[PDB]
Design a protein around this nucleic acid. Structure first.
Lengths: 115, 122, 119, 56, 229
RNA sequence: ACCUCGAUGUCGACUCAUCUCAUCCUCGAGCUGAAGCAGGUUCGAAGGGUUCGGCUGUUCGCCGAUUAAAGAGAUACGUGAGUUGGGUUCAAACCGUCGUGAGACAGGUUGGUCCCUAUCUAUUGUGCCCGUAGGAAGAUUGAAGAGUGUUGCUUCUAGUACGAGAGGACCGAAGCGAGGACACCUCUUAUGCUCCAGUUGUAGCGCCAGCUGCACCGCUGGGUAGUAACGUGUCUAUUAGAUAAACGCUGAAAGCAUCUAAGUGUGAAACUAUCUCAAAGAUUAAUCUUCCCAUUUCGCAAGAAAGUAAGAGCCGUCAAAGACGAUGACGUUGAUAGGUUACAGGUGUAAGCAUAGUGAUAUGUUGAGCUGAGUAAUACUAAUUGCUCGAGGACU
RNA sequence: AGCGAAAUUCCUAGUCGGGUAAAUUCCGUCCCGCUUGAAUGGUGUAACCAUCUCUUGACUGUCUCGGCUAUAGACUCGGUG
RNA sequence: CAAGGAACUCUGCAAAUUAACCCCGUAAGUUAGCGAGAAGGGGUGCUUAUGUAAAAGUAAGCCGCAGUGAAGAACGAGGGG
């Protein structure tokens, strides 16, 4: 019959967040995950900067990295995922919204903040 | 993606330097490596003051893969190295110091000695 | 096959669309291949749309698909454009060009169509 | 490949039977009286009532 | 009878978070309350079935015999006509919504005419290997492989029937089972089904009852955001 | 030496397999010098599949680690008008030997050219014509069919039994995987040539700036739709019958005994239906429903001119389609496509301007500007105010 | 004499060693040389070989493991053929 | 083109990597020529100044993910015959 391709968002409205911080390419943020076990749900704090943001709807994702014991680990996270907590502390100064080059660049990979 | 003939690292202090996968456990040509899977390796480089010397064939478990894998929680984690932990024919590992990150897809598989002796769980 | 004419690359398509857009806005009528027109009209009326704002940056933009012709030069032809064709169709939304197929060729029976612009 | 036995006249006929062509459309042009093909231009040039091409 | 069915259109596919912390792939199907247009009895008509109709449009576009049959039956003039074999749970002159018929915890079967593709190669269709390149490959190095069976007059001298040969892929009904039901929309009347659906974008879909596990009903509930700063 | 020396390309391997059981296995049963456990023999069962390497040109062969399992074999020791060649198998030769001599080695070694534009048949799709006894439109069942049924690990049942101690279950359930088959691009990627940003050299657009041409799309970093995957999602069941090897109940001939001679049972992933898809050219041309029409006047004894108003075809717009045809939707009674606008998304802070700054540069204008294909409105334009075939229910 | 299972071996996949996960080819070594063997030369040899072979460092689409992008084809149309 | 780096193969065929400038550094062998550009290194943009004749050199700042940014540029090592 009559097609919308817009009701996708309407049915995705059932899972939305009402805070939604800003993230483009340089936000130094620590993210918390409510890891659920049989008892005493743990709260993990994972810090790092964001490389690039991709999204169309509920499918909104961002990147975040840590470096512990010399080993770096990078993880993607969907924004509208429950059991996740985001608390921003630094806004950075970047040139392009899509950057990925920390994968190769060595130590002292930090970036100056947005003055 | 990570498989046979892959010189990987070691995530443990065992007096070894370099090790290569020799075969993957599993029937009907598994031929692929995934996180938490028990595999068999052979040391290629090791220190003279270590427990193993080159030519020894041992069994290990991959802890970190360069490509990583998607987790059932709905998130996917990427690693930046390829390391394995050595296990001495039982549920106890060969080593005595687990340093660095380790995959969480192996907690339900047992081998909790590494988990309790791990510096961190991710 | 192997080494031959450089083929019908996308650069060829850009060169063509530039050439017959300049040709049509130069005189106002072209008989050409059907599909060449069919994918040209879009660029035609997109340029017509962006030219009805009369901004220096939009003019910088419309310089990017025009070359000189045998009758006027780029500056005079774009002045002619802004002077009469944009004031003509400022009101109506869309429909900035028309095409109607011509007869089959005696040679290869290829699809000619006449492209023109009027009210 | 290469033929082994010669193709017969009636195989040639049956292969040619589907190797033919059909007729074409046709229509009447009101203003320029001419039996033109449908959805094409006329002898005087008006595909519809519109004739931007030269009448020559 | 016990295996029910309904007609839909795949209008998209999404991801929805679920209980036990799993991101389940979801597909949204637009499903109107379809119009029954005839019932066939297992005894008098020798087999039970239900003729179903949907996608009603203006009567002007429809062809004369179909609209005449509809006017004789006195129901809505629709363009989409089909059948469902052995479904007799309802009666004539009724519009059925899957929300009232299907469960939010039932395992279902899904069939759909697959995506039209044209002619396909054997490598794509039966997952054959692609020949190597080094040591001399020959310009044929990626094809359907060997078809030889026998050489010599009394060995085979024949091509088998059912030989694995490149042909046309897609545009046929595919069977996937054990799909879950998560979400209902009544104002827009959409159904959310776990997994994905074959075929191209915007195809007609059979949502049918799973034969293997028709009686199983397990609950899968959602999550609620409770954060604000 | 019988086809065959006026040609049967003469070892594999690579991919691709097909077929039999003179079973590799999981399957079932019988028997044991079968405590359990692990076994060994035999029968039936071929439904499914049955590794990666090292040497060697490789078969065979052995070695290393797996794996429930590394089968037996054949199909010109399978397969080049699918690939190519490691050498036997043209010379060029080299080494050892034989021979006075050229030469010779199923002696070894080095390098050593593989043609074919499918005519028939058969195969996968695909169409036109006609057909099935008025035509069209739908919906159909299905005789014959096709694909398909692999299981591993862990835990508990339970250290219960067996057993003496060690050792250590079968019946079942659950969970977790391997391989394969079935789709998708929502997570993940990879490509993504009329997309975005940057950047160099040069030729230019009269100078600067801003853009274009070539330099692999010049390059770099990405990315729309799309396409696929290494990614997700699904699956390997389960039921009933006939059963096979088998164990029987009852019970005779053969008074006891006996699974058989009467009746009758349970019993295998084998078999059949059930699992999934096509399927009336199945001429045995099958079923149902609906619509359209059935129309003065005759023969070589008769249905001759309005030939539907049903529809189909011609043509166009296109694409959930598409080698082309066809397929699917739409043609002023239309949003079918194109266009405009709007949105989403992506790139990323456009140009221009002011200031700091003599200078690269930075800040504000700014999440600005731009965007090929995504999304919806919108007759603004193109699909015309068109043409052809096509209406008498025959017969007993 | 030198050297040697090597372009030299038939019994051989000869003994063992060295590296190699696992070595008929790779390196060394034993000497019984069916017949090595000295100007048909032989034993070693620096550079070099569009030379033969082996191991190893980086490197990857040869392979697991395929898919894409545009062309020139094929394909369709028109023309000779 | 994700990911391994030789697992296909008789051979790393091909493919891939390196690439030029300047200045570091370069074993053994040995006939003292070489090896050798051995190997193994670093860096090359713009603006200003120091700058000589231009060019190198240097100082300071700045842009960018990376700057012979585009193209034109030996991949080596060991060992055996």
């Amino acid at each position: 019959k009559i097609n919308k391709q817009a009701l996708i968002d309407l049915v995705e409205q059932k899972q939305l967040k009402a805070y939604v911080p800003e993230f483009s390419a340089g936000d130094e943020v620590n993210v918390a995950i409510k890891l659920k076990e049989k008892e005493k749900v743990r709260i993990q704090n994972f810090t790092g900067t964001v490389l690039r943001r991709r999204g169309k709807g509920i499918s909104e994702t961002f990147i975040v990295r840590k470096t512990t014991d010399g080993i770096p680990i990078e993880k993607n996270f969907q924004i509208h995922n429950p059991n996740i907590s985001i608390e921003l502390k630094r806004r950075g100064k970047v040139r392009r919204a899509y950057i990925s080059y920390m994968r190769e660049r060595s130590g002292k990979a930090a970036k100056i903040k947005e003055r | 993606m990570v498989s046979f003939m892959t010189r990987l690292n070691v995530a443990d202090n065992t007096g070894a330097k370099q090790v290569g996968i020799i075969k993957v456990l599993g029937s009907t040509r598994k031929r692929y490596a995934f996180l938490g899977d028990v595999v068999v390796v052979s040391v290629k480089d090791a220190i003279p003051s270590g427990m193993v010397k080159k030519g020894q064939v041992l069994r290990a478990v991959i802890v970190r893969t360069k490509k990583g894998q998607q987790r059932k929680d709905g998130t996917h984690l990427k690693f930046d190295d390829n390391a394995c932990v050595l296990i001495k024919e039982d549920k106890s590992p060969r080593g005595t110091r687990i340093f660095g990150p380790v995959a969480r897809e192996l907690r339900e598989r047992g081998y909790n000695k590494i988990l309790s002796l791990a510096v961190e769980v991710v | 096959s192997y080494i031959n004419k450089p083929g019908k690359t996308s650069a060829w398509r850009v060169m063509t669309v530039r050439q017959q857009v300049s040709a049509v806005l130069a005189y106002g009528k072209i008989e050409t291949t059907l599909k060449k027109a069919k994918n040209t009209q879009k660029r035609l009326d997109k340029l017509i749309t962006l030219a009805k704002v009369d901004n220096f940056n939009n003019r910088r933009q419309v310089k990017k698909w025009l070359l000189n012709t045998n009758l006027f030069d780029v500056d005079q032809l774009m002045d002619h454009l802004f002077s009469k064709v944009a004031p003509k169709y400022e009101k109506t939304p869309g429909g900035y060009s028309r095409v109607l197929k011509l007869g089959p060729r005696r040679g290869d029976a290829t699809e000619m169509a006449i492209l023109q612009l009027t009210d | 490949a290469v033929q082994q036995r010669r193709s017969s006249k009636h195989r040639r006929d049956k292969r040619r039977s589907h190797d033919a062509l059909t007729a074409q459309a046709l229509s009447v042009c009101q203003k320029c009286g001419k039996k033109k093909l449908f959805h094409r231009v006329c002898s005087c040039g008006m595909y519809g009532d519109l004739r931007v091409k030269k009448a020559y | 009878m016990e295996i029910r069915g309904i007609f839909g259109v795949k209008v998209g596919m999404s991801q929805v978070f679920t209980t036990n912390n799993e991101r389940l792939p979801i597909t949204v199907i637009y499903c109107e309350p379809n119009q029954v247009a005839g019932v066939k009895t297992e005894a008098k008509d020798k087999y039970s079935a239900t003729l179903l109709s949907f996608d009603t449009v203006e009567n002007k576009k429809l062809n004369k015999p179909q609209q005449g049959f509809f006017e004789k039956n006195n129901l809505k003039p629709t363009k989409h006509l089909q059948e469902i074999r052995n479904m007799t749970g309802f009666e004539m002159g009724q519009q059925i919504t899957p929300q009232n018929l299907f469960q939010v915890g039932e395992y279902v079967d899904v069939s759909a005419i697959s995506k039209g593709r044209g002619f396909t190669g054997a490598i794509k269709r039966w997952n054959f290997k692609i020949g190597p390149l080094g040591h001399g490959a020959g310009y044929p190095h990626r094809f359907q492989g060997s078809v030889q069976a026998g050489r010599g007059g009394a060995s085979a001298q024949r091509v088998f029937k059912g030989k694995k040969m490149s042909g046309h892929y897609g545009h046929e009904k595919v069977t996937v089972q054990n799909l879950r039901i998560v979400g209902f929309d009544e104002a827009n009347m959409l159904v959310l089904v776990s997994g994905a659906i074959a075929g191209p974008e915007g195809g007609v879909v059979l949502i049918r009852t799973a034969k293997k596990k028709p009686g199983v009903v397990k609950p899968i509930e959602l999550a609620v955001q409770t954060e604000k700063a």
